[PDB]
Amino acid sequence: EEPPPTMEEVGKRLGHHNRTISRHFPDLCSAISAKCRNYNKACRLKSIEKL
DNA sequence: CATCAGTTCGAGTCTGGTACTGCCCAGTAGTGATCTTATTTCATTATGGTGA
C-alpha cells in the first residue's frame, strides 16, 4: 500500500519492542525496511522531477 | 521434605555504529542618491615709504 509502514509502526501495532522481532527475523524485516525506503526514494524522485 | 541457593531461557531496555530527508536564509558585491567633511580658491583689508 501507500507509504509502506516502517519498523516503528509495525512494532507499535504488534506491541513488541523492535529488538524482539530483530533478534529472530532479520531477512524479512530488512525486506520491509528496503520496501519502505524504496517507496520513499521513488516518491522523492517523482517529486523532484515534477518540481 | 520444602526452603533456599546455584543455573537457564528468553524478553526489556540502551546504545553505539551506520546512512539519509525536507526544506530558504545570510553574506557579499554592483549601482544610484544624498548627504558630509579635511582641505583648496576668491575676493576685500590692513601695512608699507617716496617722488611729484
User: Could you tell me the distance in Å between the CA of residue A8 and the C1' of nucleotide B34?
Assistant: 64
Residue A16 CB lies within 7 Å of the nucleic strand B: yes
Alpha-carbon span A43 to A51, nearest angstrom: 12
Of the candidates A35, A51, A50, A34, the residue with the CA atom closest to the CA atom of residue A2? A35
- How big is the CA angle at A20 (ends A10 and A42), to the nearest 5 degrees? 35
Asked if A6 and A35 touch (Cβ cutoff 8 Å), the reply is no
Asked if A6 and A36 touch (Cβ cutoff 8 Å), the reply is yes
Experiment used for this model: cryo-EM
User: Could you tell me the distance in Å between the CA of residue A18 and the C1' of nucleotide B20?
Assistant: 20
User: Could you tell me the distance in Å between the CA of residue A47 and the C1' of nucleotide B12?
Assistant: 41
C-alpha cell at A48: 523532484
